[PDB]
Each structure stands twice: as structure tokens, then as C-alpha cells.
Amino acid sequence: ELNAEIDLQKTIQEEYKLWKQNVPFLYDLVITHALEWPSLTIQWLPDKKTIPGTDYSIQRLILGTHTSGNDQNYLQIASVQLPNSYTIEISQKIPHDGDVNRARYMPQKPEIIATMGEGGNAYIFDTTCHDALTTGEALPQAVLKGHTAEGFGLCWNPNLPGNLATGAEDQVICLWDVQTQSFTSSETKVISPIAKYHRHTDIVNDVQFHPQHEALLASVSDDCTLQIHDTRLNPEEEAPKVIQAHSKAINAVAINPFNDYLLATASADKTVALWDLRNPYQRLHTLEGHEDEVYGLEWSPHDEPILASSSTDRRVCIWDLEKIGEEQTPEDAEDGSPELLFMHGGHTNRISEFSWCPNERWVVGSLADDNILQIWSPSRVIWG
């Protein structure tokens, strides 16, 4: 429909202009970078470099490309200045087979990066074994051969070095043991799964290991279930918990890094549901505020009650669970429920991914399909 497209372009233009006008009363920080190629994935690397005698530091982000088969794809590392504000630079490009659907660094060895790539292969790169800019086609340290179709689920086990979980559109979850010692710069190793789960009946959208329990894996799917897997058990059995969490597709799961029982799901039904693992079959609460499918989900690494979500409504929302149930005035209620702390409306296309900065409080990096990287911080008046 042409009229729909005309209206969408007009409303995005008007909303952006209204957003820019109110930025000074919303943010302590907004940095905008136009990327040469759009990225489906983003993750802060864990290192921070103070520049002494200066009011900034240097931090780094993992990006990828998705040319869609035209040109060479790349895993990239961007260096960004942050106030203790201005520049970005791609400090490393590593050739990559196909779209970078997701990229994640190994928590115990940040120079190792796993990706989800061409036709379902996952890839391992040791970025210290690659130059800053390389001529040819991809030469990964390892290809993980297992999925038969492209995928977006990818998570390292933070309590078992080299243990990786993937999930893809073939409805399969793979578990892997990546041993970096066998790597060389010469040739690509072939790794195959140590276990496969066939526990979903539709695309597997997200997997995540429990941060404090090495054998607990959570997964969510287009089949509308949230499942909790015990990784020590018979892979052919049913998962210990199958939860009918939403009535529409579930795109993301996120386990709270402070409260071991608290878990969030994000769904095409426009909501985020909260779950307690000790009564997993009815939800604790529904976070309502998005106007379209919710895709991205990440707990704050610094504050137990703070959750961020992103949506095809082009907003990133920050939720403060301590404000649940709090009395509102009618004029305040016009903005939505009280637990909706902050809305970031600076993007102008669909949000691909976002990531909380681990070295700065209240800093998010978020990407949209129109090549825009934004690094922002809501005003301390709002969150203090």
C-alpha cells in the first residue's frame, strides 16, 4: 500500500524532528555515527582505555555487515571515544562468509569471537591472528558444522570456557565445545556439535546460558514456547520445563544477572513477560509499552531492576521494575505504566540490536537498519 508507505515516511520524519528538539531535556549524552555498512549485531568489548590528561576514553564495539550476497562481508571492530565524545573508527575488518547474523566474544577470552553465518555455519575467529585490514576471503579459525539453515541464536557459557550454544531456523539447538588451543593461523578447524536438541517445532530465535549455572540453557521460539534445558541430561528427552509463555512468537530471552530466578521474554504480541523459575508456568508481570513486535532484550549489567527492550516500533525502552505498582497522576499516566522509565526514540528504521556498555553506567549502543549507530545515556535526573 502506497498510502501506508507515504504515512510511515511522514511520521518518521516528524517524530525525528520532535525527538531532536527534546534531546537536551532527555539525554546526558547522544553520539551518532553513520556506518558505511549496516550491521545486524552489536556488542561492547569489555576493555576501556583511559586517555590520561583528557576527558575521554576509548572503548570498542563488535559489528558485522550484511551485504546480502553482493560484496564481501566483514566482522568489524569499531573504536569509539566516550566522555569521562566524538569519533568512531573501524580499527579492524575481518572477512566473513555471508551476513554476520550475530557476533559474540568469549567472556573468558575476549579476542575469540563466534559468529552465526552463511547457511547455518557458525564461525570462530581469533582477532589477534588477523590484521587490521585483510585482502581476501574469510579464513576463520574454526567452522562449526551443524545447522542446515541460517540462525540468530548464539551464546557462550560464562562458566564453562569454550562451551557454546546456537539456535537456528532449522528448529535445532546445537551445543559445542570450542577448544582454542587446537587453533592455528594456517587452516580452519572443523568442529561438530557435542549435542543437538530437537525440542522446538519452529524457528529457534534466542538461546542464553544461565549466568550462575553452567548447565541451564534457556531457549525461545516461533513455536511460542520458552524452554529450560538441563545440559547434563539425555538430549532426546523433553526439556525439564516447557512454558507456553506467549500466544505469539517469542524472539528473545534474558536471564537477570543478579536475581538467579528472574527471567524475561520478548514477543511479537508487543509485550515483555517476567518469569520466576520457581513457579515457571504463570508469569509475574507483563511490561506493556511497545507498539509492535519486541525483538531485543537485555538486562542492565549494573542494576538488578533495570531492563531494556527494542521493537519494530523503532523505540528502545528502559524499564525500572521497582516502579511497578506506583501511584501515578493522570498527566503522568498519559506516558504509560510507571515501570516504563525511559523511551529512546532516536532511530528512524527498525532497530537491529543494542548493547549496554559494561564500563559506563547508563550507556547504550543501538543500531538501526538505516546504517545509524547511536551511543546514548538518558539524563541522570531520570534514573538517579
Partner: peptide
Amino acid sequence: NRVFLRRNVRAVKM
């Protein structure tokens, strides 16, 4: 369709 929360601006402006 809110692009920001007005109560946020009210909090920051004053």
C-alpha cells in the same frame, strides 16, 4: 505514538 515520555522532559526541565 510517543517518541519520548513527557514526564521525562518535565523531570529534566525543572
